[PDB]
């Protein structure tokens, strides 16, 4: 059908329909008379799966042969979404498919939708693993993801009543085609026993087993014929476990539970018990796997030559204490020798500063789970600490300050410090966030080592999130430019010679309809509700919380709520406000947001004097393959944090790909993104990072902006009276009483510019032809913020690998 | 390589080659380079599957086109075993595929033993279900069997100092390559609730739900191209249970224990919540997938002549009052009409007599769990007490020892007479179990309805107990006389004009001869011990349990030792003495008896002057697949159950059709099997079932045989003393006590007698020739004890559906 999708071969689509039919008979011993829609995927999703395998094959081979310094990305979070697609599109298998599927009377894009999202994350942390799995693939890295393999990932969000109900994603029930379990490289994973130590040294006894059993799955690389391995570890229990008889068996499951469920607890830190154990299962596993492989290639002196381990945040931090154990207990190199080589293998990615956030895990915890690494963490702590104390002499401010063990009622190990002391590099996510690092958390760190701090402002792959999801987007810039920027995104700037083409302007806006056409319908089929197409389609899709203000976004639509009501025969630029995420479970105030954003739009949504020209619409169960459709159909993206507070952000570069303006703060990737645009091009608003300072030194008081601001003291006494929750009038007195008393997030200083900047966002919309133009500027500089550039720079100024954009051959 | 093998034909070699090489590469995603015997395997195991499933699919497909009567047999239990060798010898495709895997260098008979048996039974009742299943899809019936997926089997048995280790038996580690999930096949089950009265009858409400999702497995008919099903539920929780967030999804596994984990109690009953949850799972499931089936053909009248539902023991007894819920409460039939279709549907074998074995459970079990079922049991005793009272009128004892309600501190429901009250057929599993039946357990129910009470002799299919286990015999049967015996097993009487012919001597000499080699190997190979094969090798294997009297055995064995030790210098005719089997878990008796045995073994096999003369091996793990080893290499058969206790047997059957003599009791299908070879050509001994009666009415004094039998008195004081158990010198004083003072099964009674019978096996070896006639004469006469001649006989008398011999289409 169209160029980007690759060609469809007459010899291609008679074996797709061959093998097709194999697969439909052979592997799920059906014929065509009994086949359901679900079938027919499993069909296709074998008949792609076996495209793979050859190239899977040959490039481990290429990897034993070449023996290339190897990379591992260690992460609890995978966010995978869909595997289908996007093999199709890295194995350029996408027009004959469709072809192939539709000679045998079958819709692929019907058959796309009965997949399952591989949902093992929460939000931006885990979509970054992805991301970077894409692009390390793309260019030739040597790279193996290692995480664990939930049998639930983030729960499925239904509303009911206008709240949040969760339940479980059992995203195995009808199988993954795509994983290949590999029960012969199972390992054990030790916990709970108690030190002796002997002559020999220190020795870890009366230790309780888990057993690791790890599962490949595929990561085809872009047209270059590499497939690179994500290994996830699943625990099941040694056949001696417990071995009256029943209950010996049943009590199995206990053992199998540390690799069952995510914690949905997005930016936010619970000590419990079980997290820790899937943070060391992670590691114990994948550090036996990588060493494994190192010996087959006695000298560990190489081992920094051949290993990078990449820590996504301190979930996998114990990669420290652990080789330092394997390498002093097991493998018997002295101390020094073994820091120096754990030094130079770890590198650590910080991913916030909300402090929050920050793993500090109880000592009374490691002590009874950890016994070997907690004695191993003290011993890195004191030598860490006479580093110190010669560096900055007298100083003991900074001892107490630096120490990886915090005092307190419990003491508790900073997992942050530890990264940081046993790693040769500590980045951040985007430039203003590596910057703060320096300037606050980090301060003391970054004056004893300058060296280990970077930035690898973080990207997204335009393989996912512009040739998968937005065809007709791809397609018309293709026409122009070729395919090439598809692998090297900063080839899009030749599009800025295309600004004052009517041909391309035409183009650029009839996909943004088309795309909006298309997302209009699927809410009305799926969903049950009706949105004028014509509409600015205003967008805040990411996970509820405070310091994202969600909140923000509800005060400017009761706003323009307010407004028509006052002035109901004036003119508005006609908008649909969708606002989705999930909320962690028990966070309280995220489901308040929630339960807020159903009530508006309650009110809003039938109110007859405002007819089309408002929608409110919470979208429900926001994921991967949501954001796919949501993100294309755009026209506002909204990203709206308190300065200081969004660590990067990669939904905002998503919607920039697709062809959305952004309204923001200076926060994150904002600032390099306008940098990128200009400001001109850029619904730039609100405090800087050093404004939120000045109003934190004489304090936020709330009321003054209640007292000045007759638009909002409005709001505030709607929410209080109940005018959004006429039976239960006092539902929303907790969101009232923050936003006057407890705001961390300072939304009444950000209300007024916000308000004003989004009368901007509405003038420009009602010149087509000019937000078109400011549009193609957004695209056409959108090209720093391909995870191709940033993992180019981890290889080149982390890893010391180079990056490869050589075919392997087929 | 040998005739009974099939064909390998160039073209067949050449796929099998090509298409194992497939599945090497596409389906294990392996090199040649990195396959482990594993990987081979599990290739083979798909090329052979392959084969399977255009003759499953074309066998569902004519079962829909013809609609005959369907046969469903319900069973908690399937002792399948290993699949692999099975589908090659019913597909005629062993010699292909060992032409196949040799010209690629492998050795198929390793790879063979590389499948894990799948386990999911205990002994002879689920041993009897799948001999049944091959059975049934030989003969062309329309049948399904029913259980449930357990994820642990029978557990695998240790020894460890000479006593049982218990390990779980992890079968499905690996992945079940015969299996084939149906998620979309699953069905809800409710248990718990409580029961509403409306105008509409009565309503099963508040229930939970735990979902059944089905596992279809292939059973191919010998050489006719039927394919059948045997479909088995495994649990999953509903995707809302329990829905803090992380408990809620870790307690699903409570809901998916049902299906985890097989009873290892073998002929005892516990009344444990769990086992009557996995009852009453597999009877709600496997009820609505026949009445939904049924449906796919308004009127129930018809239903008996389109299903018959089998019922393997009373472990699926709810059956009776779920076809009365689902009738009556859901389908609106009145009581009466639907009665009439339950009792024309169901059938009910029963497998014991031995009163701790039945099913009572409990009321308040039954009233928690299954409310309704407590209410429609209550109405069915009901009715079927006035039916008593008015065929014996007056007679109030008998109305308390037919009810189905047994009184008591608990109250409990009769599972057994349930069955009766609730079926049209009623069999016993052996000519004189069935007659022991309508004497004394149910006397009153045969005097109320003597029409229902039948004989079913238990037979063994003669593929996996022949072809299979012992191609070398089957070879030798086929040079003389074809291969149509093997199934048609009467044909085998053709071989009495053999008995005299030298040649046919010196063949069935040979093999048993080089089985003795082979299984003589085996035990150095896998567990490091040395046995002489010019020994006579007297096998006892079967469950442990005091009925089957291993007991007696030991005492024989002490016998033998205690007369070398007196007289070393006389010759005896040299024994190896294997003994093997499992004791339930918590049967502490069944747990000594293991002991003693391994005791005796550490005495016995290393006395210098006993020599190679006798020697005891406990065989470790006794399972299907050992059974298939050691059973081809067995002289003599110890079938020495006191007589009335064993129902049936069935490795009694085995042993026959494999070369053995067998020295046994007149009890179970002994008495038939010499009624077939004659008395003369059968080592009969001891007490009949009129003696055991006749010592029970004057009372078994066990110090009678201690008084008088001087040899018998020497061997309870070594055991007293401590000869067996230098360390523990009162390890075995329960064992002496229960012989002493509570032995239900008079070992003491039977003693005499069996040395004696035991003498003249040790004359008869002493002249091979003779040896070898009489075992011509039982093989020859083994052909009523095919399992087809049962479900021919199961098909004509209680189904009600003409077996057929005729090839579907390929
Ligand atoms: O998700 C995170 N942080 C986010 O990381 C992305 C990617 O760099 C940034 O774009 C974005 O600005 C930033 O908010 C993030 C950071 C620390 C911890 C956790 C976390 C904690 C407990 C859990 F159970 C699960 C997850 C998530
Ligand atoms: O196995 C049985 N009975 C046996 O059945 C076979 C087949 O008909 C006969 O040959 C043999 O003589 C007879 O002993 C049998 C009979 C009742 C209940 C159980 C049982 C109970 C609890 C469990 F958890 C598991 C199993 C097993
Ligand atoms: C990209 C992405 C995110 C991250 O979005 P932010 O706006 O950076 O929080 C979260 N969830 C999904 C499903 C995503 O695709
Ligand atoms: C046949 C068989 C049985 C039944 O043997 P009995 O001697 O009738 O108790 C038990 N276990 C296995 C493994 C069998 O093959």
Same mark, same amino acid.
């Given at each position: 059908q169209i160029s980007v999708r690759g060609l469809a071969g007459v010899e291609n689509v008679t074996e797709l329909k061959k093998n097709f039919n194999r697969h439909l008979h052979f592997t799920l011993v059906k014929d065509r008379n009994v086949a359901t829609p679900r079938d027919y995927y499993f069909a296709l999703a074998h008949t792609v799966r076996d495209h793979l395998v050859g190239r899977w094959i040959r490039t481990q081979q290429h990897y034993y042969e070449k023996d290339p310094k190897r990379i591992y990305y260690l992460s609890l979070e995978f966010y995978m979404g869909r595997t289908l697609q996007n093999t199709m599109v890295n194995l350029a298998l996408e027009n004959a498919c469709d072809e192939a599927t539709y000679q045998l009377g079958l819709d692929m894009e019907e058959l796309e939708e009965i997949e399952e999202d591989a949902?093992?994350?929460?939000?931006?942390?885990?979509?970054?693993?992805?991301?970077?799995?894409?692009?390390?693939?793309?260019?030739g890295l040597a790279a193996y993801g290692y995480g664990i393999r939930y049998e639930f990932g983030i729960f499925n969000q239904k509303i009911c009543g206008g709240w949040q109900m969760e339940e479980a994603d059992d995203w195995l029930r009808y199988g993954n085609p795509w994983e290949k379990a590999r029960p012969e490289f199972t390992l054990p994973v030790h916990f709970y026993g108690r030190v002796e130590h002997t002559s020999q040294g220190a020795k870890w006894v009366d230790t309780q087993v888990v057993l690791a059993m790890p599962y490949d799955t595929p990561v085809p690389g872009y047209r270059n014929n590499v497939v690179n391995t994500m290994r996830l570890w699943s625990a099941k229990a040694p056949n001696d476990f417990n071995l009256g008889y029943i209950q010996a068996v049943l009590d199995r499951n206990l053992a199998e539970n540390i690799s069952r469920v995510l914690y949905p607890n997005d930016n936010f830190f619970e000590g419990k018990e079980l997290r820790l154990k899937q943070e060391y299962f992670v590691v114990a596993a994948t550090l036996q796997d990588i060493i494994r492989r190192f010996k087959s290639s006695t000298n560990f002196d190489a081992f920094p030559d051949k290993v990078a381990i990449q820590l996504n945040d301190t979930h996998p931090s114990l990669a420290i204490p652990e080789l330092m154990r394997?390498?002093?207990?097991?493998?018997?190199?002295?101390?020094?020798?073994a820091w120096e080589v754990t030094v130079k293998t770890c590198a650590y990615?910080?991913?916030?500063?909300?402090?929050?956030?920050?793993?500090?895990?109880?000592?009374?915890?490691?002590?009874?789970?950890?016994?070997?690494?907690?004695?191993?963490?003290?011993?890195?702590?004191?030598?860490?600490?006479?580093?110190?104390?010669?560096?900055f002499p007298g100083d003991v401010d900074r001892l107490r300050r630096m120490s990886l063990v915090e005092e307190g009622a419990v003491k508790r190990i900073n997992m942050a410090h530890l990264?940081?002391?046993?790693?040769?590099?500590?980045?951040? =996510? %985007?430039?203003?966030?590596? &910057?703060?690092?320096? /300037?606050?958390?980090?301060?003391?760190?970054? +004056?004893?080592?300058? $060296?280990?701090?970077?930035?690898?402002?973080?990207?997204?792959?335009?393989?996912?999130?512009?040739?998968?999801?937005?065809?007709?987007?791809?397609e018309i810039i293709a026409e122009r430019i070729g395919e090439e920027?598809?692998?090297?995104?900063?080839?899009?700037?030749?599009?800025?010679?295309?600004?004052?083409?009517?041909?391309?302007?035409?183009? =650029? %806006?009839?996909?943004?309809? &088309?795309?909006?056409? /298309?997302?209009?319908?699927?809410?009305?089929? +799926?969903?049950?509700? $009706?949105?004028?197409?014509?509409?600015?389609?205003?967008?805040?899709?990411?996970?509820?919380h405070e310091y994202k203000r969600q909140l923000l976004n509800c005060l400017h639509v009761i706003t323009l709520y307010n407004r028509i009501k006052k002035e109901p025969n004036k003119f508005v630029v006609p908008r649909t406000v969708m606002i989705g995420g999930k909320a962690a479970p028990g966070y309280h105030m995220a489901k308040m947001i929630i339960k807020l954003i159903t009530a508006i739009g309650d009110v809003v949504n039938h109110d007859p004097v405002v007819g089309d020209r408002l929608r409110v619409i919470f979208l429900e169960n926001y994921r991967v393959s949501l954001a796919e459709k949501v993100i294309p159909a755009a026209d506002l993206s909204e990203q709206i944090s308190t300065?200081?507070?969004?660590?990067?952000?990669?939904?905002?570069?998503?919607?920039?790909?697709?062809?959305?303006?952004?309204?923001?703060?200076?926060?994150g990737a904002n600032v390099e993104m306008a940098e990128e645009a200009g400001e001109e091009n850029f619904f730039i608003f609100g405090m800087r990072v050093e404004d939120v300072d000045r109003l934190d030194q004489r304090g936020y008081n709330a009321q003054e902006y209640y007292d000045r601001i007759p638009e909002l003291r409005q709001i505030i006494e709607q929410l209080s009276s109940g005018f959004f929750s006429p039976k239960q009038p006092d539902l929303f007195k907790d969101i009232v009483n923050m936003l006057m008393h407890h705001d961390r997030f300072k939304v009444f200083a950000d209300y007024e510019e916000y308000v004003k900047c989004q009368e901007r966002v509405s003038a420009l919309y009602k010149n087509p032809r000019e937000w078109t133009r400011m549009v193609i500027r957004n695209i056409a500089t959108s090209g720093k913020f391909s995870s191709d550039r940033t993992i180019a720079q981890y290889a080149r100024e982390i890893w010391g690998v180079e990056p490869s954009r050589q075919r392997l051959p087929a």
């Open positions: 949902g093992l994350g929460n939000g931006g942390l885990g979509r970054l693993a992805a991301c970077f799995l894409d692009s390390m693939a793309t260019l394997v390498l002093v207990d097991l493998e018997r190199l002295d101390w020094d020798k990615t910080n991913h916030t500063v909300l402090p929050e956030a920050l793993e500090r895990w109880p000592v009374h915890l490691l002590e009874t789970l950890l016994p070997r690494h907690l004695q191993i963490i003290y011993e890195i702590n004191q030598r860490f600490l006479n580093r110190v104390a010669a560096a990264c940081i002391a046993g790693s040769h590099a500590v980045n951040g =996510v %985007a430039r203003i966030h590596s &910057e703060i690092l320096k /300037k606050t958390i980090f301060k003391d760190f970054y +004056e004893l080592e300058p $060296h280990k701090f970077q930035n690898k402002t973080n990207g997204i792959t335009p393989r996912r999130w512009l040739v998968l999801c937005n065809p007709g987007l791809a920027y598809i692998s090297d995104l900063d080839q899009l700037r030749k599009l800025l010679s295309y600004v004052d083409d009517e041909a391309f302007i035409r183009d =650029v %806006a009839k996909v943004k309809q &088309e795309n909006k056409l /298309k997302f209009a319908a699927y809410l009305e089929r +799926e969903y049950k509700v $009706h949105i004028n197409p014509n509409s600015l389609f205003d967008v805040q899709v990411k996970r509820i300065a200081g507070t969004e660590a990067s952000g990669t939904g905002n570069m998503k919607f920039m790909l697709n062809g959305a303006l952004t309204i923001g703060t200076m926060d």
